[PDB]
Design a binder for these strands. Structure first.
Lengths: 396, 397, 395
DNA sequence: CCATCAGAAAGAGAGC
DNA sequence: GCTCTCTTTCTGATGG
DNA sequence: CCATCAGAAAGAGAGC
DNA sequence: GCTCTCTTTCTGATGG
């Protein structure tokens, strides 16, 4: 079983986790937490079954232990162990070598080499998840190889997606299906850590792709005419779910009262054309302006209403559409065309405009907003020409 | 059984390694260290199973041994042996010939003529390395031949590379597959004498290569365009083997996903152009588990990602292409041309940029990151010129 | 059997033996030589069976070989192979490490581990020789061990002695009496490289040596008076054992009859002092040469009479006693000191003579033979000064 | 840093 | 007796 | 609705 | 070349 170290050994707390409901070997629903220590030469893992010791398990703190257990190399300190706060003259010196080694996550190829029954600790990016009835196969993967993780009990069907840093605590290796599988035990724990960030502009495809996508109205443009023959009215809008954002082309302006910012909507028939979500009828927008939902975690906000960088545009496919705000400094007018020379702190370029938008009155010395301009380039310099669904307006 | 020498014999300690752990005859995990001693007439290789004698096995120290074993012409000392420091009046003087002839490694061809089970000792050159799943085979070669060595267990893929100088301690000859091999033993030990770096630029080319190669990306950049007429995509990257490093060009932007730093990759049917290696189809990379246990050298990383000095650039043959980072201090724009005089802690030069990359706004005080630039010069200094595959970006504080 | 290497390979010749007789596989005696050649990455041993290639197989020559054979990893050249003369722009740069490994001998401890029939080359010191009726056992030794070498036929009872160097080419391995031995084969060769008789001045010591040392008298001086007051007489002699030479000061001149060149004598109860050997009484020496065969090698004879070069003397410790023959250039005399300028190709110094030896007539152009002079120096140069035991003469 | 390797320089044996 | 040369040796050199 | 701060990880230095 | 540690950077996180 688990041997017993009875010598008063001095240690220092490196890391720890929060109390969480576990199932003790007595079929109760108690609470426990994890932690790691480090002596003058080595480091240990620690299980804590007594939840009243959470104070002395703060990091950068020294404590002396006696009458503690040791199972499979892991120290076990329960409700019958001695954990006392050390004195200023009872501190051990841990070099900055055991510290950077304790928190090192192993390689998966080396998990495929061990014997059955051992314990592991580490964080891994998730490759693919496959939910089953009572467990789930979490395929974690790093540069060293792939392996399977089986999760049942309290960790069956947990809130995570394909790409989360799954920090794992106390898992047993098992030879299942002739391949290395990793199953949990009884003292296990999983803290989830998603690195959620995505700039650029999400472009959902699939034509006739109907359904729901109850997003949130963010920034919108006033309506305008884009076909002077038939006086067709439209306006662009940028909206976002909690995961992504979408640039919307609205062709029925009666939803101007429903495309007000800071509003939440669930919108139906959408056709993924040129990366835009093109609505063709107001009947796809329920007001629903009394039922909350999202919050959009700040960083998504600025991401959606980001103003791109000319350096970033030099690296996009010649045919993609833009939306940003930039400073003008030049202006030449040639036969019905108006070239607006612009640039920022990264690069400069030309912006050509032809058609109705010549009626825009602007001169160097004030900023300018752009929406839905194609990306082109010549031998001389790059360009962002005015297309059919274009729009622009000068600011303060 | 072995033989037992129960009489005092004086020796002079020559070489002595550091303590290392082994699996003793009782399959316990004990400590031992190797040592080479020499009498006035004959030298002797010696084993030390009692690590407490660590101080009395120092070079230039004379000792006397009593009640010590010996096997295959090699002395042994465990816990049941008496080793005593010899006083300065008990000095024996071992000539310089035993010193030059103890560290002399036996020629390989003569190792190809020893009996099955014989034990050897010598430093040799790593000509090619190969790691199995169980053991690890090392093909060594010198002026007399080649021979493979089986390193299983404690010697299953160590920390070394081709071109080093590995010191083999106590490896046994065994006819495997018709040819001799050096299999591991109970008292095996290997200490290294590293060498080889290959800094400077990458390597040469093999036009329309038919072979394969496994490296690891070290510095990838963003994609871009090098042709304005027909929209042609490409991006630069840095890759490396265990020993060599290479700066690569990729023209099918699709292979931007497979080209990530720290990614072990694989490349086949590749072209070579002016120090850079050209790929043309996505059917050349398969980042699907080629070798997980590959260890890249930190100095190699710092050499491939290295940025040369202006003085060093002066000593290069013009025609080689430049990559790295420098700082700007002058800015002079003329007709559709912009000049950026860069400088470092050795001097200053010029950078001539033309065309599309003139649409970038760099200013003195911010660092400029150049990749793939020609190296030209005139009577009035040196330049880095922007060519068909030039790339750069601005980074500041 | 052997395998055949068809492709041209360019090599630099490292070594070659003189030609020697051997028996061919068809039972005919012919000449062959052994060579060692190298490429830029590897060395090879080569057996050369076509003696017309003698001039091509010369050291530091570059040659191009094709249609050659391999047996046990060693190359073989017969009448069917081609060996041409490389052009100057076809030379190769052979690393010195390769020459080092090719000229290196295997250790005996590793030879003893060899499989039966393995072929070896190397140079080893002979420790013991036993000559039987039909073969000879040469027990050789190096720092790693000893092994017996069995020679027969041509290599039976060759003219060598313990201490000589034997260069062995292409000997095979055979187990005899459970002990590994080396044995001669079809292509074996031996070359002898002197022995181990190299002097380096006598030894010191000082205790009353009660032992004897049957030495041969090499050189002697006429008796002379080294103390004028009491008329004390002595002479100097150089003598040699077989491996060593010693300088003897004889203070009992009755031994003059016993010290004659070529006579062999036994010296007992002698005293080392200041690097010389001393004989205080006539009973220490007997005229009987009870070892008529004593042999003093020419290397030891010539080396024992050698006069040290002056520049070499500049490096010697002050206070040592020196004997040598030097050419006299300048002669000046001041208040009973005589200053004789002497010199050789290495340099120039002064011989300072005081007292009785000032009666020796010497003028510029004469050559001075000095025995037992003290080496000293001043700020202006180096001198050889006459002392109590000094002797000198003009030749 | 840890000891190796290499060009230069000194020492031994054969020959004119 | 002198000279050419193979052998042996010390210290500067390499390297990342 | 926005800026500052902080822990981790890649890159570099002193010394072995 | 190898190792401990000082330095620099990208990105996720805080709050009145």
């Amino acid at each position: 079983g688990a041997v017993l170290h009875s010598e008063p050994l001095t240690v220092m707390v490196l890391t720890a986790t929060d109390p969480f409901e576990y199932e003790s070997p007595e079929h109760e629903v108690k609470n426990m937490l994890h932690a790691t220590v480090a002596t003058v030469s080595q480091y240990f893992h620690v299980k804590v079954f007594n939840i009243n010791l959470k104070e002395k398990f703060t990091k950068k703190n020294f404590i002396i232990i006696s009458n503690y257990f040791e199972s499979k190399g892991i120290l076990e300190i329960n409700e019958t162990s001695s954990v006392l706060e050390a004195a200023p003259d009872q501190m051990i010196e841990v070099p900055n070598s055991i510290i950077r080694n304790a928190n090192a996550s192993p390689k998966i190829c080396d998990i495929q080499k061990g014997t059955s029954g051992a314990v592991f600790y580490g964080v891994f990016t998730l490759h693919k998840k496959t939910v089953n009835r009572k467990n789930t196969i979490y395929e974690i993967k790093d540069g060293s190889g792939s392996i399977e993780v089986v999760g049942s009990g309290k960790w069956h069907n947990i809130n995570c997606k394909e790409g989360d840093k799954l920090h794992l605590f106390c898992f047993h290796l098992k030879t299942i299906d002739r391949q290395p599988k990793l199953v949990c035990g009884e003292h296990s724990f999983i803290k989830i850590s998603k690195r959620g960030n995505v700039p650029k502009e999400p472009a959902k495809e699939e034509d006739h792709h109907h359904g729901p996508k109850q997003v949130m109205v963010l920034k919108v443009t006033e309506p305008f005419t884009y076909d002077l023959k038939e006086d067709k009215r439209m306006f662009h809008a940028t909206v976002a779910t909690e995961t992504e954002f979408f640039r919307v082309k609205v062709f029925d302006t009666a939803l101007k009262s429903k495309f007000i910012p800071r509003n939440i909507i669930a919108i139906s028939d959408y056709f993924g054309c040129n990366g835009f979500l093109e609505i063709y009828r107001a009947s796809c927008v329920s007001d629903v302006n009394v039922n909350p939902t999202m919050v959009i975690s700040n960083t998504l906000r600025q991401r959606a209403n980001a103003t791109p960088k000319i350096s970033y545009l030099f690296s996009q496919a010649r045919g993609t559409f833009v939306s940003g705000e930039y400073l003008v400094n030049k202006k030449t007018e040639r036969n019905k065309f108006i070239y607006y020379g612009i640039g920022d702190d990264t690069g400069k370029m030309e912006v050509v405009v032809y058609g109705r938008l010549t009626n825009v009155r602007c001169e160097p010395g004030s900023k300018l907003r752009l929406v839905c301009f194609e990306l082109t380039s010549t031998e001389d310099g790059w360009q962002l020409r005015s297309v059919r669904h274009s729009y622009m307006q000068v600011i303060n």
